[PDB]
Design brief:
The structure is cut from a larger assembly and holds two copies of chain A. By secondary structure, chain A is mostly helical. Chain A is built from two helices and no strands. The termini of chain A are far apart. Chain A: It is found in: Virion.
Chain lengths: 48, 48
Amino acid sequence: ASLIYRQLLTNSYTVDLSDEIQEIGSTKSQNVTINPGPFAQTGYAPVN
Amino acid sequence: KLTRTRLDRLYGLPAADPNNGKEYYEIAGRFSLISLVPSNDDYQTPIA
């Protein structure tokens, strides 16, 4: 009767496929690079 | 100096013939152009 546990242990390769079966159903998007760090200032030259 | 005239001490280039029939004035000189370009250096792009 312990066959179910040896089974669930054994046939644990196929799971992998299933996961990407989710992925093939899944949407995917990328996120462009962000520019970190502070940024320098710039005012205006003496305007006459 | 304008021949057959009554006015003395006249200056300034004329509208009569500023080129004397000759060619354009040529000048070789440098020029600096300091400006705030818009330019996304490397970012806002796929990180892959």
